[PDB]
Design an enzyme around this catalytic site. Structure first.
Site, PDB file in Angstrom:
ATOM      1  N   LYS A 177       0.842  -1.188   0.000  1.00  0.00           N
ATOM      2  CA  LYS A 177       0.000   0.000   0.000  1.00  0.00           C
ATOM      3  C   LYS A 177       0.878   1.240   0.000  1.00  0.00           C
ATOM      4  O   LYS A 177       1.965   1.246   0.583  1.00  0.00           O
ATOM      5  CB  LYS A 177      -0.947   0.025   1.202  1.00  0.00           C
ATOM      6  CG  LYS A 177      -2.183   0.866   0.974  1.00  0.00           C
ATOM      7  CD  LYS A 177      -3.051   0.257  -0.110  1.00  0.00           C
ATOM      8  CE  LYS A 177      -3.958   1.296  -0.735  1.00  0.00           C
ATOM      9  NZ  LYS A 177      -4.936   0.677  -1.667  1.00  0.00           N
TER      10      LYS A 177
ATOM     11  N   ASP B 155      -5.464   3.732  -7.279  1.00  0.00           N
ATOM     12  CA  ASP B 155      -6.417   3.755  -6.178  1.00  0.00           C
ATOM     13  C   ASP B 155      -7.125   5.103  -6.097  1.00  0.00           C
ATOM     14  O   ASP B 155      -7.128   5.868  -7.068  1.00  0.00           O
ATOM     15  CB  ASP B 155      -5.728   3.416  -4.857  1.00  0.00           C
ATOM     16  CG  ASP B 155      -6.487   2.368  -4.066  1.00  0.00           C
ATOM     17  OD1 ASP B 155      -6.357   1.169  -4.389  1.00  0.00           O
ATOM     18  OD2 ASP B 155      -7.203   2.739  -3.113  1.00  0.00           O
TER      19      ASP B 155
ATOM     20  N   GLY C 160     -25.039   2.754  -5.951  1.00  0.00           N
ATOM     21  CA  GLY C 160     -23.779   3.422  -6.272  1.00  0.00           C
ATOM     22  C   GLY C 160     -23.554   3.287  -7.764  1.00  0.00           C
ATOM     23  O   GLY C 160     -23.483   2.189  -8.316  1.00  0.00           O
ATOM     24  N   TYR C 161     -23.444   4.434  -8.435  1.00  0.00           N
ATOM     25  CA  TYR C 161     -23.353   4.463  -9.889  1.00  0.00           C
ATOM     26  C   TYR C 161     -22.129   5.234 -10.364  1.00  0.00           C
ATOM     27  O   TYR C 161     -22.232   6.091 -11.245  1.00  0.00           O
ATOM     28  CB  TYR C 161     -24.620   5.051 -10.508  1.00  0.00           C
ATOM     29  CG  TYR C 161     -24.861   4.587 -11.924  1.00  0.00           C
ATOM     30  CD1 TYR C 161     -25.140   3.255 -12.200  1.00  0.00           C
ATOM     31  CD2 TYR C 161     -24.793   5.476 -12.986  1.00  0.00           C
ATOM     32  CE1 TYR C 161     -25.357   2.827 -13.494  1.00  0.00           C
ATOM     33  CE2 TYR C 161     -25.005   5.057 -14.281  1.00  0.00           C
ATOM     34  CZ  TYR C 161     -25.288   3.732 -14.529  1.00  0.00           C
ATOM     35  OH  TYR C 161     -25.502   3.313 -15.821  1.00  0.00           O
ATOM     36  N   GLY C 162     -20.965   4.946  -9.793  1.00  0.00           N
ATOM     37  CA  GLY C 162     -19.734   5.497 -10.321  1.00  0.00           C
ATOM     38  C   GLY C 162     -19.342   4.820 -11.617  1.00  0.00           C
ATOM     39  O   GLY C 162     -20.186   4.218 -12.291  1.00  0.00           O
ATOM     40  N   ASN C 163     -18.065   4.911 -11.986  1.00  0.00           N
ATOM     41  CA  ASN C 163     -17.586   4.200 -13.166  1.00  0.00           C
ATOM     42  C   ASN C 163     -17.728   2.693 -12.985  1.00  0.00           C
ATOM     43  O   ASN C 163     -18.161   1.978 -13.899  1.00  0.00           O
ATOM     44  CB  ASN C 163     -16.132   4.585 -13.441  1.00  0.00           C
ATOM     45  CG  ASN C 163     -15.594   3.970 -14.714  1.00  0.00           C
ATOM     46  OD1 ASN C 163     -16.067   4.266 -15.811  1.00  0.00           O
ATOM     47  ND2 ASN C 163     -14.588   3.117 -14.574  1.00  0.00           N
ATOM     48  N   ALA C 164     -17.384   2.197 -11.793  1.00  0.00           N
ATOM     49  CA  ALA C 164     -17.458   0.765 -11.526  1.00  0.00           C
ATOM     50  C   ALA C 164     -18.889   0.256 -11.637  1.00  0.00           C
ATOM     51  O   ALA C 164     -19.136  -0.800 -12.227  1.00  0.00           O
ATOM     52  CB  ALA C 164     -16.883   0.462 -10.142  1.00  0.00           C
ATOM     53  N   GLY C 165     -19.847   0.999 -11.082  1.00  0.00           N
ATOM     54  CA  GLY C 165     -21.234   0.560 -11.143  1.00  0.00           C
ATOM     55  C   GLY C 165     -21.782   0.549 -12.558  1.00  0.00           C
ATOM     56  O   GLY C 165     -22.494  -0.381 -12.957  1.00  0.00           O
ATOM     57  N   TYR C 166     -21.470   1.590 -13.334  1.00  0.00           N
ATOM     58  CA  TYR C 166     -21.941   1.650 -14.714  1.00  0.00           C
ATOM     59  C   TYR C 166     -21.361   0.506 -15.535  1.00  0.00           C
ATOM     60  O   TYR C 166     -22.084  -0.166 -16.282  1.00  0.00           O
ATOM     61  CB  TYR C 166     -21.585   3.000 -15.337  1.00  0.00           C
ATOM     62  CG  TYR C 166     -21.474   2.965 -16.847  1.00  0.00           C
ATOM     63  CD1 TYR C 166     -22.588   2.722 -17.638  1.00  0.00           C
ATOM     64  CD2 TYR C 166     -20.256   3.173 -17.480  1.00  0.00           C
ATOM     65  CE1 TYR C 166     -22.494   2.685 -19.017  1.00  0.00           C
ATOM     66  CE2 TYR C 166     -20.153   3.139 -18.859  1.00  0.00           C
ATOM     67  CZ  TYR C 166     -21.274   2.895 -19.621  1.00  0.00           C
ATOM     68  OH  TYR C 166     -21.174   2.861 -20.992  1.00  0.00           O
TER      69      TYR C 166
END
Ligand SMILES: NC(=O)c1ccc[n+]([C@@H]2O[C@H](COP(=O)([O-])OP(=O)(O)OC[C@H]3O[C@@H](n4cnc5c(N)ncnc54)[C@H](OP(=O)(O)O)[C@@H]3O)[C@@H](O)[C@H]2O)c1
Length: 416
Positions: A102, A142, A216-222
């Site tokens: 990390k 990240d 949750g509809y960020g880039n990952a959700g879309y």
């Protein structure tokens, strides 16, 4: 502090369901390497400002450590240590030759210009060179980092190393022009889709025309919804952003939903879709539920009302352990938090292999390899679940810790 202690407690409750020696558990509690450095840069006004950078290598028994970089102003050494500990298990549950890493810098990038951001990345690499490398520590995308930052970091590392080895392989998430790999943007979503497909296959559920609810509809959700409707052919019925959510039994195509969000700033007021809140989406009766928003959305307060057969938590632990137990006793096949979002780290591993070997793959090859890796990892976790009669998250923890402990025993680090 609180994050590292909670991670240690999670490791303890994981270990108390598996046969691991006490000395190995103590070794796993304390990360191997902590590197706190000063990152000096010169601002646009000419003044020199120094930030605090953290690089935590929790373990490297399984291989070179891998870990994302977060330029969050609230980042703390404890938070970085806890995230490295989580990364160890996330790379172990997928059977990658990686340890847990990390990185972070105490800085708010909203107030930093492009020149200042480049200088910060370059100086951070100059500071942490001696404890990183293609075969030692691989920084990764990240929160609050974009691939241009990694491009700058790779350029600085290549300049310092004098191009003696595979510089492209020192970090992942690089732009496709230089050492990049295809499928990086959809990596986490594609891994989530593969996990959902494997869960459906395990439960015997055919996903043709089924119901998926994504919070949750960020880039990952879309990407998750789009790839779900494309590959699995499922019907999206509800998607929500940080502000509100929409509901439509007929089916939602994520393309125009993202267009609406880009235009008006939110997915609310979708044509033909009833405007509902996050709680209605979570409590909605669907075949599969996917929380892809800020963590801690499902708690013991709102766990008994969940009706989805499969829960695929993309976010880093958005469901509390009490809610985990409640969903488990309700006959719901959950998915571990670090297992679902392991598509990003798997694709980063793929890009690292591409850089190391000097051979780059196409979209189809990367997708097939990710499919194989996700299928094998999820099946291993499910077999542990069935055999040990424990939770999905607990089963994934057992698998990851067992792999790391076996690696430590093989290296001779622990005699028992
Ligand atoms: N996390 C990732 O790995 C990730 C995610 C997405 C894209 N990418 C990569 O990055 C590329 C896309 O660029 P990017 O995501 O770095 O963002 P970008 O193209 O650098 O965005 C430009 C910036 O200017 C602002 N802006 C954009 N359009 C504007 C307009 N019409 N009027 C006024 N201001 C405007 C935006 O501010 P606001 O931000 O305030 O809107 C944005 O931050 C893609 O090729 C993709 O490969 C990577």
């Amino acid at each position: 502090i609180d994050p590292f202690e909670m991670a240690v407690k999670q490791l303890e409750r994981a270990a108390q369901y598996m046969d691991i020696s006490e000395e190995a558990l103590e070794w796993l509690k304390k990360p191997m390497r902590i590197v706190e450095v000063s990152v000096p840069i010169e601002m646009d006004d000419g003044s020199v400002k120094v930030f605090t950078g953290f690089r935590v290598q929790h373990n490297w028994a399984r291989g070179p450590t891998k870990g994302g970089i977060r330029w969050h102003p609230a980042e703390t050494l404890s938070t970085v240590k806890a995230l490295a500990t989580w990364m160890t298990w996330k790379v172990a549950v997928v059977d990658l030759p990686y340890g847990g890493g990390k990185g972070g810098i105490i800085v708010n990038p909203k107030e930093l210009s492009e020149r200042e951001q480049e200088r910060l990345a370059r100086a951070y690499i100059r500071a942490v060179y001696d404890v990183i490398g293609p075969w030692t520590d691989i920084p990764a995308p990240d929160v609050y980092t974009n691939p241009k930052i990694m491009g700058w970091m790779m350029d600085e590392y290549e300049t310092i190393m004098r191009r003696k080895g595979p510089a492209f392989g020192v970090i992942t998430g690089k732009p496709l022009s230089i050492g990049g790999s295809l499928g990086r943007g959809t990596a986490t979503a594609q891994g989530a889709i593969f996990t959902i497909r494997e869960a459906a296959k395990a439960l015997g559920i055919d996903l043709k025309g089924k119901k998926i609810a994504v919070q949750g509809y960020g880039n990952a959700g879309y990407y998750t919804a789009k790839l779900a409707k494309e590959q699995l052919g499922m019907t999206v019925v509800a998607v929500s952003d940080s502000r509100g959510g929409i509901y439509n039994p007929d089916g939602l195509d994520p393309d125009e939903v993202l267009k609406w969000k880009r235009e008006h700033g939110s997915v609310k007021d979708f044509p033909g879709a009833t405007n509902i809140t996050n709680e209605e989406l979570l409590e909605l009766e669907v075949d599969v539920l996917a929380p892809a928003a800020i963590e801690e959305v499902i708690t013991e307060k709102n766990a008994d009302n969940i009706k989805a057969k499969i829960v695929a938590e993309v976010a880093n632990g958005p469901v509390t352990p009490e809610a985990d137990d409640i969903l488990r006793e309700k006959g719901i096949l959950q998915i571990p938090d670090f297992l679902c979002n392991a598509g990003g780290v798997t694709v980063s591993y793929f890009e690292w292999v591409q850089n190391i070997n000097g051979y780059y793959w196409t979209e189809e090859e990367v997708r097939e390899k990710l499919d194989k890796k996700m299928t094998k990892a999820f099946w291993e976790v499910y077999n542990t679940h069935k055999d040990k009669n424990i939770h999905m998250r607990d089963a994934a923890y057992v698998v990851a810790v067992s792999r790391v402990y076996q690696a430590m025993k093989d290296r001779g680090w622990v005699k028992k």
